[PDB]
């Protein structure tokens, strides 16, 4: 298939891997920090989803250095993946408009 769809699919699979690894790594980093809430895997996975999407309900967040570094990777993976799907949609439309126009 075309590159842009393959990159999107790949980005999605990769995003999902980062969400899972990120939930797990966040708990490892945050336990040991008094006051931390990002300490059980189920809510950490939810946290990873809210981080990759930038939804920002604000109910959970890292307080340690490594928990924050993990958070940054999840954000960037999420922003990039959704940015890449947009770029893929644009490429699709540009090609179609070319066809609809006789080129």
């Amino acid at each position, epitope marked *: 298939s075309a590159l842009h769809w393959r990159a999107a699919g790949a980005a999605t699979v990769l995003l999902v891997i980062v969400l899972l690894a990120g939930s797990y790594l966040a708990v*490892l980093a945050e336990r040991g920090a008094p006051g931390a809430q990002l*300490i*059980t895997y189920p809510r950490a996975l939810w946290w990873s989803v809210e981080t990759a999407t930038t939804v920002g309900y604000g109910d959970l967040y890292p307080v340690t250095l490594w928990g924050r570094l993990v958070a940054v990777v999840v954000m960037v993976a999420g922003i990039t993946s959704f940015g890449l799907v947009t770029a893929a949609l644009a490429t699709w439309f540009v090609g179609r408009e070319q066809e609809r126009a006789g080129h």
Partner: antibody
Amino acid sequence: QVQLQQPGAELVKPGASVKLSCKASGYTFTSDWIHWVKQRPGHGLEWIGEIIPSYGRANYNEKIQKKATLTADKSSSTAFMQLSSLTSEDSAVYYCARERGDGYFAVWGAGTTVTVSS
Amino acid sequence: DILLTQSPAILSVSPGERVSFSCRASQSIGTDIHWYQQRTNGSPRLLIKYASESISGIPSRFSGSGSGTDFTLSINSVESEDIANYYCQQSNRWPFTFGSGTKLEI
């Protein structure tokens, strides 16, 4: 069948150290945490610390004098707690418990009675 | 760290009566409270998780409720085997902590 196996007792001379063990069977995941809880006679349960065997990381009750050091041997599925320089205050039953990373202690060991005496 | 207060320390009830144990947290912890039962010389046994969720193997008589800072563990129709110490434990913030325990007397 018994999920968590602990020795019945350990006698320790004042000033000496002892290594308690907690052998796990049943389902085992890379995400399990093994906790240790202390209970002095007539008293409640006091959380001592925790360890995730798959990684080797340990956390401790910071609020109490640190008497313990946690380690784990992945090949024998055993978690250990090194108690050092003990006094009669350290005499108590020490439980190990398994937590699936979701906050509660699903199953507990029978406990090891530690007596600090000469 | 979160202080879990269990008062009264001893609860006396008559046979077959509904009984309620109280557990109060120093700050809001959602429903991240779990209950354990510990009979004389036995090890703790999980009774209720996340305030009101059932554990397989535990009698229907046991139930839990509450959210925020105030929690309750109830037993419909107390019977002799229920004589024990009851503890609450929170997992909302690190480190996990235990309540001071309530002993049930019939």
